Amino acid sequence: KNKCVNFNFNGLTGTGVLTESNKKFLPFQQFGRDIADTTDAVRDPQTL
Amino acid sequence: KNIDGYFKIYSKHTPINLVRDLPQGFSALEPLVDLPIGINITRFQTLLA
């Protein structure tokens, strides 16, 4: 966390800084998105 | 609803004071389960007790 890394989470390949988000996702809701429609946040499939 | 062999169900349960018909208000429906049944469904029934 708090570092620039290349991450592939649940088949989703991306590069960015991983931080803990204060947003509360529903159990089913996973991928968050901003106005730009790019992925804002994801969920760790191993340890949720 | 069923699309592309994948069934989708959306469940919301909240208490309300109602007599008949439907109350006028807003509600946000959320999913319930995930059922990849993949079968043709042309009819449905409502079970009662």
Ligand SMILES: *[C@@H]1O[C@H](CO)[C@@H](O)[C@H](O)[C@H]1NC(C)=O
């Ligand atoms: C489902 O079966 C009914 C009756 O045979 C048919 O009219 C309908 O087109 C079928 N739908 C699909 C998606 O195959």
